């Protein structure tokens, strides 16, 4: 509950105002988070910190990440809103149990005459710990987030249950009830089935103009008629203050109207509940600052190719394409940009942005891998190890086993999910290297990694059986022909007690800030690779990637 209150205090700085904005209180479910790659148990271990940034429709830069507030409830979230429970008396309000999740209100980019561009993206981040494996990022579209209409209708009948539940709960408590409570029961009874939150979700109703709904009735009820010819709320507000002993502003809005709009998440197909309170200053609240959010951009874009029966606005004729441009000068960016960094007016277009970078990084290896290995080389060893007479027989196996691994690396490296790939030691070198041309997010980079080209990063891979990535956290080692090696400053990974290539069953792969790669096989035999040569990316892409995956340095 309180996570929405605290955030509106932040939105009260009106932000800038020069760039107008809005705010939407959102309740994510747990099953939407679970499908999002979120361990649920880790959050449970009372606010929680979340970074957010907004991302442009087609071309541009993302907002710099900004910290918001989040509070996770491992219980019915909508129920806590609907039926607040006196700490002393639980039995006062019976209700139906449900699931829930964190509460975060989200920013909405407005305009002068505020109208949201649909398919524009707002983003979260969830940090279970320092390293990026403990960080996830979720995306949302202003279409996804903003429902067209709210509902305060279904919440009306709810309040009368309270006036009944109070009057019912006091009647049980009888003599033990404090006199002020019995008093309010008298009036509240003069103003006069458990509470199920999923009614308001499936309720078929919402707010309406209702102007002709009054005039409909007077041409109705005269038909008919000519054929013939201290509010209750203050007592409720004093109902708690009798059984509470405190105002508890969280409850005060719960006694008011509460707008619950069920939504669905395009990513996980799951549900997340958008909520706007009655007194809430954010979107949907009865107290709100103009201008408000309009569908003017969105509604036209549907019928533009709908009346044309066309799937895409680029298959729309440029006459009608310029038609909305005349009304809407912002649509130039997605429509008129020759080489949009994002596929304009799409959904998965953002994903295509990621996956192509995945491919871009891979070829930067295979071509560079092929480079140094092309004519049969002599790698010798860049490391220092002593071998026993029996260990030689093992090394003989490394010969035969040598080529199969080099496949399996790039096999899995290609096979990795594009999301999780960005937590790997190689993707960090890129985000480090392009940043060198800031602080990449999750602080995976050691502070001295920017000191010398000797500071490195590493991953490990199983030599026998399935070839896998044995290391969550990329390991940082400095090297100094043979030269010794040492770790850096700081749950447990047994892989971390070993130096690269020190033991069997570890393929040791590394890179640099200079992004000169090193491939270390067991026995210490290792060769350099410079993949910077084969790495090819557009600067407008590079700068756009970083601002998402890195942070402006402190």
């Amino acid at each position: 509950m309180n996570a929405h209150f605290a955030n509106e205090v932040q939105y009260d700085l009106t932000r800038d105002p020069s760039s107008p904005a809005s705010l939407i209180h959102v309740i994510i479910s747990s099953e939407c988070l679970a499908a999002a790659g979120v361990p649920l148990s880790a959050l449970v271990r009372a606010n929680f910190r979340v970074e957010t940034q907004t991302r442009a429709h087609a071309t541009g830069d993302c907002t710099p990440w900004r910290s918001a507030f989040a509070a996770y409830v491992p219980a019915d979230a909508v129920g806590a809103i609907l039926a607040p429970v006196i700490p002393a008396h639980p039995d006062l309000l019976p209700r139906v149990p449900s699931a829930g999740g964190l509460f975060v209100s989200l920013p909405v980019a407005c305009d002068a005459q505020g109208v949201y561009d649909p398919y524009t993206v707002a983003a979260l981040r969830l940090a279970w710990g320092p390293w990026a494996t403990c960080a996830r990022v979720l995306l949302f579209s202003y279409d996804e987030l903003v429902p067209p209409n709210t509902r305060y209708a279904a919440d009306g009948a709810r309040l009368m249950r309270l006036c009944r539940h109070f009057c019912r709960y006091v009647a049980r408590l009888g003599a033990a009830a404090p006199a002020a409570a019995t008093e309010a029961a008298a009036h509240l009874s003069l103003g006069m089935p458990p509470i199920s939150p999923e009614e308001q979700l499936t309720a078929p109703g919402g707010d309406t103009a209702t102007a002709e709904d009054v005039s409909i009735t007077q041409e109705n009820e005269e038909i008919l008629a000519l054929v013939q010819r201290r509010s209750l709320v203050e007592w409720l507000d004093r109902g708690w203050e009798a059984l509470a002993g405190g105002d508890r502003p969280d409850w005060l809005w719960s006694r008011r109207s509460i707008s619950v709009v069920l939504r669905h998440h395009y990513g996980t197909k799951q549900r997340f509940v958008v909520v706007s309170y009655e007194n809430s200053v954010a979107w949907g609240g009865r107290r709100a600052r103009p201008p408000r959010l309009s569908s003017e951009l969105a509604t036209a874009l549907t019928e533009a190719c709908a009346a044309e029966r066309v799937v895409r606005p680029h298959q729309l004729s440029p006459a009608a394409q310029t038609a909305l441009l005349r009304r809407f000068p912002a649509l130039e960016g997605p429509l008129r940009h020759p080489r949009p960094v994002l596929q304009p007016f799409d959904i998965a277009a953002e994903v295509a942005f990621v996956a192509r970078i995945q491919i871009a990084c891979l070829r930067a290896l295979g071509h560079s891998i092929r480079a140094a290995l092309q004519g049969g080389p002599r790698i010798f060893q860049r490391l220092r190890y002593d071998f026993g007479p029996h260990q030689s027989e093992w090394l003989g196996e490394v010969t035969r086993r040598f080529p199969v691994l080099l496949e399996n690396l790039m096999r899995a490296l290609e096979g990795t999910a594009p999301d999780a790939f960005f937590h790997t030691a190689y993707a960090l070198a890129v985000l480090a290297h392009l940043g060198g041309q800031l602080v990449p997010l999750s602080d995976d980079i050691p502070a001295r990694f920017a000191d010398s080209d000797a500071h490195y990063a590493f991953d490990y891979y199983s030599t026998s059986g399935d070839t896998l990535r044995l290391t969550n956290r990329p390991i940082a080692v400095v090297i100094d022909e043979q030269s010794k090696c040492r770790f850096m400053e700081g749950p447990h990974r047994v892989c971390e007690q070993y130096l690269p290539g020190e033991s069997y069953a570890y393929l040791c792969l590394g890179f640099n800030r200079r992004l000169c790669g090193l491939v270390v096989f067991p026995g210490g035999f290792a060769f350099t690779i410079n993949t910077a040569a084969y790495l090819s990316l557009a600067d407008p892409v590079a700068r756009a990637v970083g601002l998402r995956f890195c942070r402006g340095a402190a």
Partner: protein, 308 residues
């Protein structure tokens, strides 16, 4: 007698005429502003020529401002060779009871704290002058604290008129007026800075809740004669509701764990009720007549018991 009394001994010089020496025998219950707590001092360190700065002896509003840099003490007995005063802060006497003398035009009561004020009243600025030594003794005036705050308040308000009547008082039906006097602007600056820093720090976010209750008071002053008398005929808040419609914001930053009005009171008490102590000096003296009466008139002595 180091802790019980403390005999700070003002020495008297050799050459003083017998009309001037016998003029000190009527200096029994007085207030002497000792700079330090030395056991041997001279009249020159007591007299007004100690109080004067380089070229400048300040006005009455500035004459407060180095009292509180000093140690007030009361003359115990005027010997021919010396004058003995016990400091107020260390220790009063053996039994802890010293006698003052009302140089006020104002009668005292029992138990009321007594503040000492420079000679501001009209027909009152009586400084016993040593003609044989060219020394003046500006004896301050012991006053009741319901006056001694207003008298400072009239002086501070007079200096701020002079940056763009007021010098008339009343007390128990006795009309009295103080000396209208031009004030040095250097003295007013430290006073005005002492107002605002205690006024700006006295404002908190919870005080906006209190501000919303102003039209309730004029809704209440139409029925309660107690509230109708409390505000004033010339109050600001009676005028500050006909042009002012106050309101409160809806939510508070971290408004679940903190108390809005309880933080409003403590910051108010620490700066606004504290403010009168910063303008004047502290009334470290009250009067407890053991057997005399309930009202101590002017010119008479009064027993003194120390005041926390």
């Amino acid at each position: 007698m180091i802790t019980d009394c403390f005999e700070a001994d003002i020495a008297i010089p050799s050459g003083i005429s017998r009309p001037d020496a016998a003029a000190l025998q009527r200096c029994e219950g007085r207030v002497v502003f000792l700079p330090t707590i030395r056991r041997q001092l001279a009249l020159a360190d007591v007299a007004h020529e100690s109080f004067v700065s380089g070229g400048v002896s300040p006005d009455t509003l500035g004459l407060l401002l180095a009292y509180r840099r000093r140690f007030p003490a009361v003359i115990t007995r005027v010997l021919p060779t010396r004058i003995v005063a016990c400091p107020v802060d260390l220790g009063l006497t053996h039994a802890g009871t010293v006698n003052l003398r009302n140089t006020s035009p104002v009668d005292l009561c029992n138990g009321d704290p007594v503040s000492l004020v420079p000679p501001v009243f009209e027909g009152q600025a009586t400084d016993v002058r040593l003609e044989s030594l060219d020394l003046t003794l500006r004896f301050p005036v012991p006053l009741p604290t319901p006056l001694a705050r207003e008298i400072v308040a009239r002086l501070v308000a007079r200096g701020i008129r002079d940056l763009n009547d007021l010098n008339v008082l009343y007390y128990n039906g006795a009309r009295l007026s103080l000396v209208a006097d031009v004030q040095q602007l250097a003295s007013v600056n430290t006073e005005l800075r002492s107002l605002v820093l205690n006024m700006v720090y006295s404002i908190t976010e919870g005080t906006t809740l209190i501000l919303t209750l102003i039209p309730r008071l004029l809704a209440l002053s139409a029925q309660d004669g107690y509230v109708n008398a409390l505000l004033q005929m010339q109050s600001v808040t009676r005028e500050a509701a006909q042009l002012i419609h106050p309101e409160a914001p809806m939510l508070m930053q971290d408004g679940e764990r903190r108390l809005p009005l309880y933080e409003a009171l403590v910051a108010w008490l620490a700066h606004a009720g504290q403010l009168g102590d910063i303008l004047a000096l502290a009334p470290a003296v009250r009067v407890c007549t053991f057997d005399g009466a309930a009202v101590v008139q002017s010119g008479d002595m009064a027993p003194v018991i120390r005041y926390p």
